Design a protein around this ligand. Sequence first.
Ligand SMILES: CC(C)(O)c1ccc(-c2nc3c(F)cc(F)cc3c(=O)[nH]2)cc1
Ligand SMILES: [Zn+2]
Length: 209
Amino acid sequence: GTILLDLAPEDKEYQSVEEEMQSTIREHRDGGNAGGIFNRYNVIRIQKVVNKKLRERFCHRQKEVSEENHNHHNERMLFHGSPFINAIIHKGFDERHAYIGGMFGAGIYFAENSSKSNQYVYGIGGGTGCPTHKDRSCYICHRQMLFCRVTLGKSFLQFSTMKMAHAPPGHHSVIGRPSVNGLAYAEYVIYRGEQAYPEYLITYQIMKP
Ligand SMILES: CC(C)(O)c1ccc(-c2nc3c(F)cc(F)cc3c(=O)[nH]2)cc1
Ligand SMILES: [Zn+2]
C-alpha cells in the first residue's frame, strides 16, 4: 500500500513545496468564510506519497495523453483540498468521487492557489469547519492538503460555468480562467482519476494575522 516519506525542512524539495504553498495565498471573495482568515501557513510536515501501482496508472495515462496531444502531456503541479484526503492518498484520485456541484460539472478540481484549495479541506464552502471546534477559521487544528501532479493534456478554456460529465470532445481537461466579471482565481478540472497523482501531503495550520 501507500508509504509516506517524511521530507526534512532542510531539504530543497520540502522548501520548494512550502514556497509554492505560501507564495500562492490570496485573499478570497467570501471574506474568509470558507477557509478562514490568514496571510501565512504554519507548515507542520511535508510527506512524499509513494505507491507504485498508483504511479503506474498515472504514468500510463500521461503517456497516452502525450501521444494524443503532439507529445505535450501538459503536466502541472496543483493543489487539492478535500475532506476525504485519506482515501486519495491510499486509493488515488477517483472520478467516481467527483465534485458533482462544481462549476464544470462532475470532475476533480485543482487550484494553482493553495488558499483556494484550503476552502475545501473541511468540505464544500468549508462545511462546518474543523471536527473538534466546528470552526472554518480554526487556528489550532492541523489541516492537510495535497500538492499534485496533474495531466492536463489539451485543455478547454472557459470563463464561466459549463457543466459536463466528461472532458469536451478532443480534450483532456477544462480550465476556468480568471476574468473581470468572472472567476477570481483559476481552477483546473479533470474527469479521469488517473490524470492526477497525490505527490505531496502537506500538514499545516493557518496562522492568525
Ligand atoms: C466532492 C468533495 C466533497 O469530496 C470535494 C469537493 C470539492 C473539492 C475541491 N474543489 C475545488 C474547486 F472547486 C476548485 C478549486 F480550485 C480547488 C478545489 C479543491 O481543491 N477541492 C474536493 C472534494
Ligand atoms: Zn479546531
